[model samples]
Target: NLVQFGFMIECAIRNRRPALDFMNYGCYCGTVGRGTPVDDLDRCCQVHDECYATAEKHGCYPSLTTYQWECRQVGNECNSKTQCEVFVCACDLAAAKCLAQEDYNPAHFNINTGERCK
Candidate 1:
């Protein structure tokens, strides 16, 4: 299925990441739920249909239609880079320049600090 949990939602659930602090007004309906506007932006929803639909209304890019990984720090444990996934590689317990599997793109994030992946 196209519906999937990207990095942000996983971070919120698994570690109570950044998005949890501002749970209110996360979606187009001014609440948190699936199939809502910018749900991906808030990391609040599972399905991205509402987000894409809302963006389409404004002729804006539907960011929800794509998967975008957040920058992670070095020393952060990581899964093996998977297809269509992207993230910064960590090195020496700090933020390191990196890329996901298949060379998705050049790295451009360093939002956190943690263990380097194996």
Candidate 2:
């Protein structure tokens, strides 16, 4: 059964907090930024958003905990896995790879000030 994978990824994108109170701006996620993306790192977040949307379209729904358990069990392989496993895992795996490819930037980690993106 699908398990609202969007919510799972949303929580991760928002850094485990309510988006309304701890909203991020632009391509930035977590408690940071002032409605502007500092670099490609922010782009990674944007790509991840798209990936989640794609997962949702495919009827893939696996909560973060379930995903963690299943992914670990399969050693990150999707062969012979459920649709939820394949899609959600692909989305998260792509995001992880994208983020890893980016250069580290301290400014990307600044605390947010509740600013909304234009």
Candidate 3:
């Protein structure tokens, strides 16, 4: 009955693994006006290609909007925003449908400006 579905849901969360290893790597924190230190050397870390200039990383810098910056997720390789959004479903086709949406933009986690995302 409903108990089976509930158990399955709990199991999935307990064993949660991002579909791609690339997703495990996130970002260098963007702090504006004052420098916040970050560790870029960890093997598990993923660097943003357009994102890692020493002065940019270490100093308060202007936020680059995707429209203005020739932006790409650089440094470490990653699955596109489309690839990582999938959560397994009762039917395999549901995962395919999630991947097929052409308009997808990955959620951005920008901490500056006190906003949830970019």
Which one is best on lDDT? 2
Q: 1 or 2, which is superior by TM-score? A: 2
Over 1-118, each residue of candidate 2 has an lDDT whose tens digit, in order, gives 1233333333344333332321242335543323555567666666666676677777664334245422332223334256666666666656544554566465445444454333
RMSD of each: 15.6, 7.2, 17.3
Overall local distance difference test of candidate 1? 0.29
lDDT of each: 0.29, 0.48, 0.24
Model 2 misplaced stretches (Cα beyond 4 Å): 1-26, 31-36, 62-65, 68-80, 111-116
Using all chains and alpha carbons, the TM-scores for the candidates as numbered come to 0.24, 0.55, 0.17
Candidate 2, residue 33: lDDT: 27
* Model 1 worst lDDT window (10 residues): 92-101
Write the number of the candidate with greater lDDT, choosing between 1 and 2: 2
Residue by residue across 1-118, what tens digits does model 3's lDDT show? Answer: 1122223223333323222322222232223222221222111122222222331444423122111111123311112222111111121122112222222223322333233212
Task: Give Cα distance to truth, residue 28, candidate 2, Å.
Answer: 2.9
- Write one digit per residue (lDDT tens) for candidate 1, span 8-53: 3334234433332332433321243433233233332222334445
* Distance from true location, Cα of 64 in model 1, Å: 7.3
For model 1, what is the alpha-carbon lDDT of residue 101? Answer: 11
